[PDB]
Amino acid sequence: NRRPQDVKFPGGGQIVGGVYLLPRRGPRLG
């Protein structure tokens, strides 16, 4: 769960849930 009320698509820093991960190929905020 990110933060502005919506439920799916951008993000990627401090994640909880393996299904949300993608293979190492980017910076981000974490």
């Epitope: 990110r2 933060r3 849930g17 393996g18 991960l21």
Partner: antibody
Framework: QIQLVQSGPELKKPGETVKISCKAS????????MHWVNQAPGKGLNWMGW????????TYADDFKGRFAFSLETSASTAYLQINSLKNEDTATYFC???????????WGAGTTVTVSS | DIVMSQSPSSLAVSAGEKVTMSCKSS????????????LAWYQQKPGQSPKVLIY???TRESGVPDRFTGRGSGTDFTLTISSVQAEDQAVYYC?????????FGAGTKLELKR
Amino acid sequence: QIQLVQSGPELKKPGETVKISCKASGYTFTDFSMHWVNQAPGKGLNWMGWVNTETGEPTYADDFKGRFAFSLETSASTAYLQINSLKNEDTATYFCARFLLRQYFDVWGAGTTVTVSS
Amino acid sequence: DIVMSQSPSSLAVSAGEKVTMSCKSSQSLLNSRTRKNYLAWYQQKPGQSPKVLIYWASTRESGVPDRFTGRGSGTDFTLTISSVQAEDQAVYYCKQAYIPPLTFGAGTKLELKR
């Protein structure tokens, strides 16, 4: 060493509110999601939720929605677990574990055991 | 919510013998993309906090005997402590983290015989 130091044992009466803490020492309190797990006396563990230690944004599990409150004092590498309107069922001990992007808990705290009673 | 079921409950084996525990999940825990299974094994001794043993359902955490082994994939995983000793007496938990909320099995107690 990387370690988490929680508050002391707490004894509150039914209905009373309580705030236990989890001091983060040994790493950067803002790089990992801090979670809170509970263990009813004699029972297994249960994931309550977690606080984003970079956004503050707290995510809660359903079984623990309403009455429970995650937060933090970033400036002090500390996270706080609050429980309002306490019930006898809420008796148990609460842990706080550092979570990785590898999806597991590499470090917990001795856990704070709160006991509700009159 | 992914429902975790551990087997057996308790389990008594003599020192030296290799024991085996099972952990099934409500649904797949395999991220087709990362190609990793999000199941970890925790060991928790009496009064202590839990202690992570294995993650990615197979990968053994740092500072752990090759005695503890985690096999499995999808929904069928199992922990196998080869050559069991008294220092292993505890309750073992498998937690799934593939999709929130995170969940634990009911725990499998490992006692020792003598």
